[PDB]
Amino acid sequence: MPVKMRKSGGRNHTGQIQVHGIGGGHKQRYRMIDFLRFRPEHESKPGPFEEKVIAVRYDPCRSADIALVAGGNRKRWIIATENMKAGDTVLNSDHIGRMAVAAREGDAHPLGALPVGTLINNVESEPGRGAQYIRAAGTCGVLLRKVNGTAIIQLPSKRQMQVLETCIATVGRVSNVDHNKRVIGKAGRNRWLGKRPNSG
């Protein structure tokens, strides 16, 4: 599961610098994270997917901690939501219903089957494209309303947007809300994160 990440340092395939002040930091091992969550398919069956959270771990590529998930027939890594506890059952279902059943902050559900007003994160842009939104620590979205075949989401940037109903999203808020309260204290830590001093 752990993969070796290649640091560009502002260098593209040509070798030119498209971004100033990036490099000189510690290396990183990219951990595979599932932004899909809509794919039970590997079990070769339409049925739902049950999960168990083994442990919560830190990630190099993101400020948000990553949670270790095991179904016992498989092991996948996700992004740890706030209030997440070790040994919690995580239910995932792509089924559509009007029942509107409340789920734990670790679960994931489509925007349509999910009640309005609940704080959510990891929202996908287009179906099957994975979640492109709110992967950062401490943030979260909120469902404003439902219009036609779409659902209106309010992003942490306060911008009101329209996201497709079939897009799956995880309820709750992302953990590590104190990340923004972290004081660097020196340029050295910035050099450790891979951020070079910018005179531009």
Partner RNA sequence: GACGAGCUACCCAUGAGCAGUUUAAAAGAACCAACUCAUCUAUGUGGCAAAAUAGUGAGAAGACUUGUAGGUAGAGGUGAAAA
Partner RNA sequence: UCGCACACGCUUACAUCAGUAACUAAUAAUAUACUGAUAAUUAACAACCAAUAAACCAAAACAACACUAAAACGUUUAUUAAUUACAUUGUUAACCCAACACAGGAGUGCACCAAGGAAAGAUUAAAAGAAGUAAAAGGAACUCGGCAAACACAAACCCCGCCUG
- The minimum distance between CB 61 and RNA, in angstroms, equals 8
Distance, C-alpha 40 to centroid of its chain:
18
Stretch touching RNA by CB under 7 A, among 22-30, 79-87, 108-116, 142-150: 22-30
Cβ proximity to RNA, 29 vs 145, nearer residue: 29
Rounded Cα distance, 30 and 35, in Å? 14
Residues in the chain followed by a break, C to N above 2.5 angstroms: none
What is d(CA 195, CA 190) in angstroms, rounded to the nearest whole number? Answer: 5
Residue 25 as a binder of RNA (CB under 7 A): the answer is yes
Place of tokens 């972290």: 182
Q: Is 10 in the site for RNA (CB under 7 A)?
A: yes
Residue 39 CB, nearest approach to RNA (Å): 17
The annotation status of 133 as a binding-site residue, yes or no, is no
Taking the least distance from each CB to RNA, the nearer of 146 and 196 is: 196
Binding site annotation covers 30? Answer: no
Q: How far apart are the first and last CA of the chain?
A: 39
Is 62 one of the annotated binding-site residues?
yes
Q: Using the rule CB under 7 A, is 2 a contact of RNA? A: yes
Q: Angle at CA 163, nearest 5°, toward 161 and 164?
A: 155
H or E segment to which residue 67 belongs = strand 66-70
Choices 91-99, 144-152, 157-165, 187-195 (CB under 7 A): range interacting with RNA: 187-195
* Stretch of residues binding RNA (CB under 7 A), selected from 119-127, 133-141, 166-174, 184-192: 184-192
Neighbours of 134 (CB within 10 A): 23
| Contacts with RNA, 54-83, as mask; x by CB under 7 A | xx-xxxx-------x------x--------
Residue among 24 and 156 whose Cβ is closer to RNA: 24
Decide if residue 28 touches RNA (CB under 7 A): yes
CB atoms within 10 A of CB 92: 21
